[PDB]
CSV table of C-alpha atoms in Angstrom, one decimal:
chain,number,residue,atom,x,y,z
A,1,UNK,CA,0.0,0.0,0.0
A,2,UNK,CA,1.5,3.6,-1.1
A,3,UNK,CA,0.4,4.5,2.7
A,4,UNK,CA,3.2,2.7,4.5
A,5,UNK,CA,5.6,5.4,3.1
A,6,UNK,CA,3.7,7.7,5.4
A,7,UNK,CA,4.4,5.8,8.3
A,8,UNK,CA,7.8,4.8,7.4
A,9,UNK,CA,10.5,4.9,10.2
A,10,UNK,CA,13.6,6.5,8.4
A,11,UNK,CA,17.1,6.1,9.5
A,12,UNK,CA,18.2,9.9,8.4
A,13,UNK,CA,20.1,11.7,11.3
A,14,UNK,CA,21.6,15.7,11.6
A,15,UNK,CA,25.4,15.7,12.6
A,16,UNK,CA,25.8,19.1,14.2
A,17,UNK,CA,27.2,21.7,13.6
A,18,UNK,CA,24.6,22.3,10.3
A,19,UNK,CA,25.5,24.7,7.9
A,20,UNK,CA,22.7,24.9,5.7
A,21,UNK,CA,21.7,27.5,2.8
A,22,UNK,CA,18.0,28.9,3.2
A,23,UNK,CA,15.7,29.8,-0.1
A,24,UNK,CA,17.7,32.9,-0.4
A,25,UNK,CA,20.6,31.9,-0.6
A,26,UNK,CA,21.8,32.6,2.3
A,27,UNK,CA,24.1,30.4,4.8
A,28,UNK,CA,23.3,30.0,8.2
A,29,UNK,CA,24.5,27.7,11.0
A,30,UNK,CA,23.1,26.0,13.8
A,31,UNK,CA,25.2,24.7,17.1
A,32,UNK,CA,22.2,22.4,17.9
A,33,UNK,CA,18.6,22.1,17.2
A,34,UNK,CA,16.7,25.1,17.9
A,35,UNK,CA,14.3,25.0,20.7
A,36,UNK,CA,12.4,27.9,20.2
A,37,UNK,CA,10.9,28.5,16.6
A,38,UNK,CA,9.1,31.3,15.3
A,39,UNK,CA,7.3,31.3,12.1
A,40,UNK,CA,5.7,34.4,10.3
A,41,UNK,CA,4.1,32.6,7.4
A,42,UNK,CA,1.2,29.8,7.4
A,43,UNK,CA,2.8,27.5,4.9
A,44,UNK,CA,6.3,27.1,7.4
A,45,UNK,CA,3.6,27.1,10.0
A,46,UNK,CA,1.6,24.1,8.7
A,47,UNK,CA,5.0,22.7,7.9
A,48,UNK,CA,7.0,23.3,11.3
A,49,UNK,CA,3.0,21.2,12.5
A,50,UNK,CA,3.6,18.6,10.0
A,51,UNK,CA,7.0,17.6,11.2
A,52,UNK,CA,5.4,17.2,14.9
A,53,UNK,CA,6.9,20.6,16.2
A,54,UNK,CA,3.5,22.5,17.6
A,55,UNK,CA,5.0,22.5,21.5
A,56,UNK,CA,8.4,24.3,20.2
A,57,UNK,CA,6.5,27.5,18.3
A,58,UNK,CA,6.8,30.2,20.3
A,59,UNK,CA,5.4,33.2,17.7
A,60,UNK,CA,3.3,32.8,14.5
A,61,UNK,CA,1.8,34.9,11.4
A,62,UNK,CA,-1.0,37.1,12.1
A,63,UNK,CA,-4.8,35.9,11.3
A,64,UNK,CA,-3.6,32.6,12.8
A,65,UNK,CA,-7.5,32.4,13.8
A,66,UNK,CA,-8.4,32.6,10.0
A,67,UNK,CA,-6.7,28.9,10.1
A,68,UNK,CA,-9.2,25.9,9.8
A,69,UNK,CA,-6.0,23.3,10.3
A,70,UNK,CA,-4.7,25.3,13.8
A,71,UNK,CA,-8.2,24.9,14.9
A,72,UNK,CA,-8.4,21.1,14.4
A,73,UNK,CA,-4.3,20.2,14.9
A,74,UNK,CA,-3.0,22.6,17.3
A,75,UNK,CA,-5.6,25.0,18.7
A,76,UNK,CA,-3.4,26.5,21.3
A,77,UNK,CA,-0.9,28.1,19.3
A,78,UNK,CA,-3.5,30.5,18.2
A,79,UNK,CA,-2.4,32.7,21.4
A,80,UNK,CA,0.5,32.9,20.4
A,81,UNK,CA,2.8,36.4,19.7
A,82,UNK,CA,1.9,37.5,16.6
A,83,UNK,CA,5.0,37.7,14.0
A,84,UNK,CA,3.4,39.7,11.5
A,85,UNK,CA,3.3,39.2,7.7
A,86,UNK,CA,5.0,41.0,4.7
A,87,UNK,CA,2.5,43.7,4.8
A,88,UNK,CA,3.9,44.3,8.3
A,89,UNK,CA,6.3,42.4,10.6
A,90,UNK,CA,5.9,42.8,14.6
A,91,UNK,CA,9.9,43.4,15.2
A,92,UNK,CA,9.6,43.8,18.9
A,93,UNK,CA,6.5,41.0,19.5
A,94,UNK,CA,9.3,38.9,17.6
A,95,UNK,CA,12.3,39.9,20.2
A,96,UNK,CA,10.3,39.8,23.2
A,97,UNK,CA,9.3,36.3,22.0
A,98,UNK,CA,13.3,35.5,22.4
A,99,UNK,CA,13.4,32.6,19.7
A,100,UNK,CA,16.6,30.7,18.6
A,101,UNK,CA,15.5,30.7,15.3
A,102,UNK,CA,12.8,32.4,13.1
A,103,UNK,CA,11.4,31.0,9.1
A,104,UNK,CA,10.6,33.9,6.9
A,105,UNK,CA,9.0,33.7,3.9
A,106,UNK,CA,10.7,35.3,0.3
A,107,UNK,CA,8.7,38.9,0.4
A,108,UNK,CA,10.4,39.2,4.0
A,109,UNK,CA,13.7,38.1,3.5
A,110,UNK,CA,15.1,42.0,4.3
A,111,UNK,CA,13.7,41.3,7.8
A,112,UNK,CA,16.7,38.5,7.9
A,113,UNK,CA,19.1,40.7,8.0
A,114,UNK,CA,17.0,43.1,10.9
A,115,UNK,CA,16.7,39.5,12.8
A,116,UNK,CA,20.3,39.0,12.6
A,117,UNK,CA,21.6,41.8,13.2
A,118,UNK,CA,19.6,41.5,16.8
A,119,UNK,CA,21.2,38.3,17.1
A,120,UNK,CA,18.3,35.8,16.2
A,121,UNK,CA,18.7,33.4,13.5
A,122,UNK,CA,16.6,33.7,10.5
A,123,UNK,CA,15.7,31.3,7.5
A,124,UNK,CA,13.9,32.2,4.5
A,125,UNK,CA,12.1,30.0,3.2
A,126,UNK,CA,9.8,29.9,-0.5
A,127,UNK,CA,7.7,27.1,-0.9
A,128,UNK,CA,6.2,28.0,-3.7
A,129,UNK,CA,5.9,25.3,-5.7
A,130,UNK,CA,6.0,21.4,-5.7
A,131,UNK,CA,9.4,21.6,-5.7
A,132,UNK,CA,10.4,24.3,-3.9
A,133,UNK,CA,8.2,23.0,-0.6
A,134,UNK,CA,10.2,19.4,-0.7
A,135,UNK,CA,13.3,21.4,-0.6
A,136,UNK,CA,11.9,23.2,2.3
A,137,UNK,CA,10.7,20.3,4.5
A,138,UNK,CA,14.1,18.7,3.9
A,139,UNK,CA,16.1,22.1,4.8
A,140,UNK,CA,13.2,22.4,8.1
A,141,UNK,CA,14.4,18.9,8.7
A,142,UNK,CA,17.6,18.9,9.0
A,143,UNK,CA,17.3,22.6,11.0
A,144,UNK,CA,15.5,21.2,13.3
A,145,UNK,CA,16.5,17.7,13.6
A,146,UNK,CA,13.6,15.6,12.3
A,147,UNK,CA,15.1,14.4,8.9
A,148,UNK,CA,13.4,11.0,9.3
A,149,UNK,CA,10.0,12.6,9.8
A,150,UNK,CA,10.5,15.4,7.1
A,151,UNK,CA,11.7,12.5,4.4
A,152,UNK,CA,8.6,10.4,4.8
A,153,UNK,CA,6.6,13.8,4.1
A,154,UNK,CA,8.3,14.4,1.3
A,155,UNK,CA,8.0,10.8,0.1
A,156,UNK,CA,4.6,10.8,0.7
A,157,UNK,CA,4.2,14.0,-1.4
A,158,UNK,CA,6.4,12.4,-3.9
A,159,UNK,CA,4.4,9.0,-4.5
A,160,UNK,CA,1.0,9.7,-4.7
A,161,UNK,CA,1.7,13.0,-6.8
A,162,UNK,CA,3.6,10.3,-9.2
A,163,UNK,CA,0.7,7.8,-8.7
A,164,UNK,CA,-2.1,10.2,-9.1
A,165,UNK,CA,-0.3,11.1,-12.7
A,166,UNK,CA,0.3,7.6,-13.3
A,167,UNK,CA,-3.8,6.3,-12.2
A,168,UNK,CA,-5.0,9.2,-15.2
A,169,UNK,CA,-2.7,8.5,-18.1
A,170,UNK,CA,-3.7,7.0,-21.3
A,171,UNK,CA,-7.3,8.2,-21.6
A,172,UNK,CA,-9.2,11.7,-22.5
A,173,UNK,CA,-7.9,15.0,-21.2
A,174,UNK,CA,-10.7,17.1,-20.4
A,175,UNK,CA,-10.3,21.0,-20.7
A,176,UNK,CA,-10.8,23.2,-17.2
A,177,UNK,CA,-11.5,26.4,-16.6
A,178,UNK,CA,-9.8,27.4,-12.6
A,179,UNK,CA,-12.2,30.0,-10.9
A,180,UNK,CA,-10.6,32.5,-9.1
A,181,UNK,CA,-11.1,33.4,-5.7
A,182,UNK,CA,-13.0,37.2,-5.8
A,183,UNK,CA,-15.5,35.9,-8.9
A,184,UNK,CA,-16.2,33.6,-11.6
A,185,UNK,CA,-14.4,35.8,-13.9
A,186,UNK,CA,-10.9,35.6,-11.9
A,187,UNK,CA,-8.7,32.9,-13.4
A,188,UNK,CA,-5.6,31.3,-13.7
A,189,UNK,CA,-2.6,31.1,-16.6
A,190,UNK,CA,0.3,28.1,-16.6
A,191,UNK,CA,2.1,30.2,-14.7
A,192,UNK,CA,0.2,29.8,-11.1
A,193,UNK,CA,0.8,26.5,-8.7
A,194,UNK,CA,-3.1,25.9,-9.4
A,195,UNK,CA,-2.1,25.3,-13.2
A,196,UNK,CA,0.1,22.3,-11.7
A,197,UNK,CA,-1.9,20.7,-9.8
A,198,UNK,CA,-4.6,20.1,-12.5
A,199,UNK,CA,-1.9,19.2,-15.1
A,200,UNK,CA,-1.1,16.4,-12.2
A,201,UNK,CA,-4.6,15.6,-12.3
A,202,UNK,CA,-5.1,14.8,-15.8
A,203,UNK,CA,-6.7,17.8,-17.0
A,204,UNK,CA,-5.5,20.9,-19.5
A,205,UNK,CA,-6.1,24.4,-18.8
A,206,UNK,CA,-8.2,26.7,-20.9
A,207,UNK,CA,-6.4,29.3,-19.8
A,208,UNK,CA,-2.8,27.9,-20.7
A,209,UNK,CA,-2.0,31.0,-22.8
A,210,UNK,CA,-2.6,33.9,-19.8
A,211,UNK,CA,1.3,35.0,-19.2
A,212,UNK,CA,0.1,36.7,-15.8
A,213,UNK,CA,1.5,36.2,-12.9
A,214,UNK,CA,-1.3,36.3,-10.7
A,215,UNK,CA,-4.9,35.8,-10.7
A,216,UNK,CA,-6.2,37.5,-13.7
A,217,UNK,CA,-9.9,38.5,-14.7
A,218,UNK,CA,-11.4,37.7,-18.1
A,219,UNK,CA,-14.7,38.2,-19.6
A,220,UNK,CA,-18.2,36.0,-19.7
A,221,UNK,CA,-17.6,36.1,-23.3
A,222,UNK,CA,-14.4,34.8,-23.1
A,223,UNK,CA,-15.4,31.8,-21.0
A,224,UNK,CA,-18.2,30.6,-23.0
A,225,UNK,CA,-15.5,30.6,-26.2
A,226,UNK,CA,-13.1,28.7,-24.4
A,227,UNK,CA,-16.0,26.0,-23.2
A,228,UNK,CA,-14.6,24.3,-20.3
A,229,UNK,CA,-15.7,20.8,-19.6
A,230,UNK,CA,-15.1,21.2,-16.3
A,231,UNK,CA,-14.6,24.4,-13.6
A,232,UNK,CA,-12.9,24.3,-10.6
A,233,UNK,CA,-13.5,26.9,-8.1
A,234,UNK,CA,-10.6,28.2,-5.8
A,235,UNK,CA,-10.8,27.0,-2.4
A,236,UNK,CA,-10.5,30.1,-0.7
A,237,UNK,CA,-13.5,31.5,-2.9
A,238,UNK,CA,-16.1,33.8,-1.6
A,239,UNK,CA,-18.9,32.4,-4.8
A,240,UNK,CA,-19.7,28.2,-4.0
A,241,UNK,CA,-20.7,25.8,-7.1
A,242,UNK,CA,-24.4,26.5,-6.5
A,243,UNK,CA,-23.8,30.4,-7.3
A,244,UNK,CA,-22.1,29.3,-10.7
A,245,UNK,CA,-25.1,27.3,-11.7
A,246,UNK,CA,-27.7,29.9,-10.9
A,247,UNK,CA,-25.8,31.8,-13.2
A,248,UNK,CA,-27.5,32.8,-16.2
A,249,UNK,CA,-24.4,34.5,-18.3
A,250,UNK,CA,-22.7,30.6,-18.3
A,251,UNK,CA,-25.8,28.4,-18.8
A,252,UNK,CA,-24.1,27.8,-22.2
A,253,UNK,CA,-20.8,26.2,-21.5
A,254,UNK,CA,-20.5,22.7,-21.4
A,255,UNK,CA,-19.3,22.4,-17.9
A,256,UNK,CA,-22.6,24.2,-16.3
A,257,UNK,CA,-24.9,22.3,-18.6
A,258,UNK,CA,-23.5,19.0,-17.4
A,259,UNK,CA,-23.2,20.5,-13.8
A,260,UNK,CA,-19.0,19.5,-13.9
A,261,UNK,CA,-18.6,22.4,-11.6
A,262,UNK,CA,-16.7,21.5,-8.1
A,263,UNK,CA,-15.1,23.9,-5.7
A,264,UNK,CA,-11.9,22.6,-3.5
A,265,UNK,CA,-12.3,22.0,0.1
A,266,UNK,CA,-11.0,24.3,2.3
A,267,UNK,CA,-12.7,23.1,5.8
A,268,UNK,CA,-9.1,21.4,6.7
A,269,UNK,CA,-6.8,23.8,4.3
A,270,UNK,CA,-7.1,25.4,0.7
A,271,UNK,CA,-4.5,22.8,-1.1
A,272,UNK,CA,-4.0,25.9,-4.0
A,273,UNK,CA,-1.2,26.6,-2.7
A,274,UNK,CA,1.8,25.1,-1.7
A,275,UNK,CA,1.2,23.2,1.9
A,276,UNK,CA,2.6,20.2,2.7
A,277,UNK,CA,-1.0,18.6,1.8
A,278,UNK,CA,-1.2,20.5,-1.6
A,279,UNK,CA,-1.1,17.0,-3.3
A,280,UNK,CA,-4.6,15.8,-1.9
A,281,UNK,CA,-5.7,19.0,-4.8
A,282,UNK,CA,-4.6,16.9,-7.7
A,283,UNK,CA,-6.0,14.1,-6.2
A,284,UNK,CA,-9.7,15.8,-5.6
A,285,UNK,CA,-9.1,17.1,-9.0
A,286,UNK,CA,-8.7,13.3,-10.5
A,287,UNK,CA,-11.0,12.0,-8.7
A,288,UNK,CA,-13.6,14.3,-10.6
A,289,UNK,CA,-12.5,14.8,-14.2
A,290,UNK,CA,-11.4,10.8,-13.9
A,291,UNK,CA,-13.6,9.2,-11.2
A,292,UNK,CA,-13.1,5.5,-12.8
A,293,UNK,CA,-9.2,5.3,-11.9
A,294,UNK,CA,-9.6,7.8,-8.6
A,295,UNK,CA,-12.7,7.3,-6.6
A,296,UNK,CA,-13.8,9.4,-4.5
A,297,UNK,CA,-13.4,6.9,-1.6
A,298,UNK,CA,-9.9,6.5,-2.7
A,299,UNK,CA,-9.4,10.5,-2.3
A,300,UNK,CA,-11.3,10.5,1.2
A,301,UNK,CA,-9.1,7.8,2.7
A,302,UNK,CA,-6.0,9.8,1.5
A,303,UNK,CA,-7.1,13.1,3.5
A,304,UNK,CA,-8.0,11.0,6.3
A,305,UNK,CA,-4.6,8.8,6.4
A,306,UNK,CA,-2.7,12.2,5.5
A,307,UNK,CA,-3.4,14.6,8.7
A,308,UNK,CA,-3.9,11.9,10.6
A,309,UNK,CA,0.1,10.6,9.6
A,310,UNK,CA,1.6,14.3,10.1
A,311,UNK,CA,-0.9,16.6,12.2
A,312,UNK,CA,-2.3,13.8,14.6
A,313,UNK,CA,-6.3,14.3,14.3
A,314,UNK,CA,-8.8,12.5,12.5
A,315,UNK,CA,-10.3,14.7,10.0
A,316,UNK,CA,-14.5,14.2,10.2
């Protein structure tokens, strides 16, 4: 069973002392593990939870109450010293907190220097795509001293990414249309993380020739020419599948006709971007656009056997 590699006991130790280089390049060192971590972004913050670390966080992002997975995984860190985000980092909250080492993400990684020049270790950190948040678990990993744990995450991502691509080969390849998150009309080119999970999933983008970098908005018109087979509304969306069919402007595109309009989950996380459980979003995805190779059993039992594995509750 793919699952085992979730529970996998894995013989990977740390020798200290770790020189390791962060996302940006830059080299930092670590005497021994750090005991105290602070985090001021949710992705290193569902990661630092995934590799069983919730009792060492000592600060975390703001709107940490915004955060369906603290709520069902680890609902006391919520109380926690606020960090900040890039809009606005809470220096002193972060001093006062006294951590021996904080994870930044990319759009903060001028706040390194700040943290380091107060004598506080700092990592940056990008997981931004697939392959960027495997490189991050394993560099969190070896920080932190939980290799083993960290390299059956990242196997776990690994295999059922490769079987999911695998389970939907050889057959159709239906077009999609990916809803954005503020309307129906919001949507997203090849280069957005959402483009890669539905090209995992057995599915092609009608919106493959958008060069934006960001969600982009697009006229009625324009989705009714491309006639997706299927749409697939952002998790995070304010609109829900029912809005999309009560409206009149798409009645004519294929996918409302033959209501093949889903939205992804978000009541755990929103898998459209990059945490550790992204994955399980090409999976929902394949297990609607090709339900005869992944059932929708199949896709429940891997949620289930996923948070369970790396965040310690059952999801209901």
């Amino acid at each position: 069973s793919a699952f085992d590699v979730m529970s996998q006991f894995n013989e990977i130790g740390v020798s200290y002392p770790l020189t390791v280089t962060d996302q940006a390049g830059r080299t930092v060192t670590f005497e021994k593990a750090p005991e105290k971590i602070a985090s001021s972004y949710y992705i290193s913050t569902s990661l630092l939870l995934a590799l069983g670390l919730q009792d060492k966080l000592v600060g975390i992002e703001a709107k940490a109450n915004t955060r369906n997975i603290y709520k069902l995984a680890a609902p006391a860190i919520v109380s926690l010293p606020n960090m900040g985000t890039a809009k606005e980092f809470n220096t002193e909250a972060c001093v006062a907190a006294t951590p021996d080492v904080v994870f930044l993400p990319m759009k903060l990684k001028k706040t390194a220097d700040t943290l380091e020049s107060l004598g506080i270790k700092a990592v940056v950190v990008n997981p931004e795509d697939q392959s960027l948040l495997e490189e991050c678990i394993t560099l969190v990993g070896k920080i932190t001293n939980n290799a083993g744990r960290a390299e059956a995450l990242n196997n776990s991502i690994k295999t059922f990414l490769a079987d999911n691509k695998t389970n939907v080969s050889g057959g159709n390849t239906p077009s999609v249309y990916l809803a954005g998150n503020s309307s129906v009309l919001s949507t997203a080119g090849s280069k957005m993380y959402q483009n890669t999970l539905l090209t995992n999933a057995g599915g092609k983008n009608v919106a493959s020739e958008l060069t934006d970098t960001y969600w982009a908005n697009v006229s009625y018109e324009q989705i009714l020419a491309w006639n997706p087979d299927y749409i697939v509304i952002a998790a995070d969306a304010t609109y829900t599948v029912d809005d999309i069919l009560n409206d009149a402007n798409l009645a004519g595109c294929n996918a409302v006709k033959n209501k093949n309009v889903v939205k992804l989950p978000n009541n755990i996380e929103a898998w459209d971007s990059p945490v550790p459980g992204s994955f399980l979003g090409s999976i929902y995805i394949a297990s609607v656009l090709h339900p005869e190779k992944v059932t929708k059993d199949f896709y429940e039992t891997c949620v289930t056997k996923f948070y369970e594995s790396f965040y310690g509750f059952t999801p209901a």
